[PDB]
User: What shape does this take?
Amino acid sequence: DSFVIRGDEVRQIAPGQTGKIADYNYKLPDDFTGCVIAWNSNNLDSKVG
Amino acid sequence: SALGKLQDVVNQNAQALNTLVKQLSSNFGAISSVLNDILSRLDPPEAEV
Assistant: This one.
């Protein structure tokens, strides 16, 4: 699963986590198994305007 | 004082039941001795802890 979120919300992607994106956008099962990969994208997903 | 033999059995049963009932009000290391308060004060990931 791939998407783009804010910097402060990288912690919210985890089992048993609460937040605006955690509750209303994306929810992980409490028994989740796997790995999480995230990297900054200012060079690609940032615009001066 | 002739019937101590039959009184001892009743006393032992009552005292064992009383100890079992009184064992419920112990933290055992938890924050509170009532789980209703624990479930209504913390998020699940530590509520279960």
